């Protein structure tokens, strides 16, 4: 998960350098993945779609 977020952060970063990732949410067919990224720590929560 962190490798995807780092790659995802760069994708957001390429379009605007000043803009920095605040929150990223990936929704799979059977599950929803939410990752909150900070320099000190990263919080990842997996919640099944209702």
């Amino acid at each position: 998960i962190p490798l995807l977020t780092k790659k995802a952060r760069s994708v957001v970063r390429d379009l605007d350098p000043t803009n920095d990732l605040v929150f990223l949410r990936i929704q799979t067919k059977l599950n929803e993945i939410m990752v909150a990224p900070d320099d000190e720590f990263s919080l990842i929560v997996i919640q099944t779609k209702g």
């Binding site: 760069s10 970063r13 390429d14 350098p17």
Partner: protein, 49 residues
């Protein structure tokens, strides 16, 4: 009797020759290393910033 010390003079002449020598020399080019560099707009901006 005809040959005389004054009549015939013998001189020995030689040419200086450098002594032959055997030497082995090995040359090997400077060590080369593999370098991988990835450049992104944000990374360039961060250094610039």
């Amino acid at each position: 009797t005809l040959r005389n010390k004054f009549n015939y003079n013998t001189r020995e002449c030689q040419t200086i020759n450098p002594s032959i020598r055997e030497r082995g020399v090995s040359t090997e080019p400077p060590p080369s290393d593999t370098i991988c560099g990835n450049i992104t707009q944000w990374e360039i901006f961060d250094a610039y910033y």
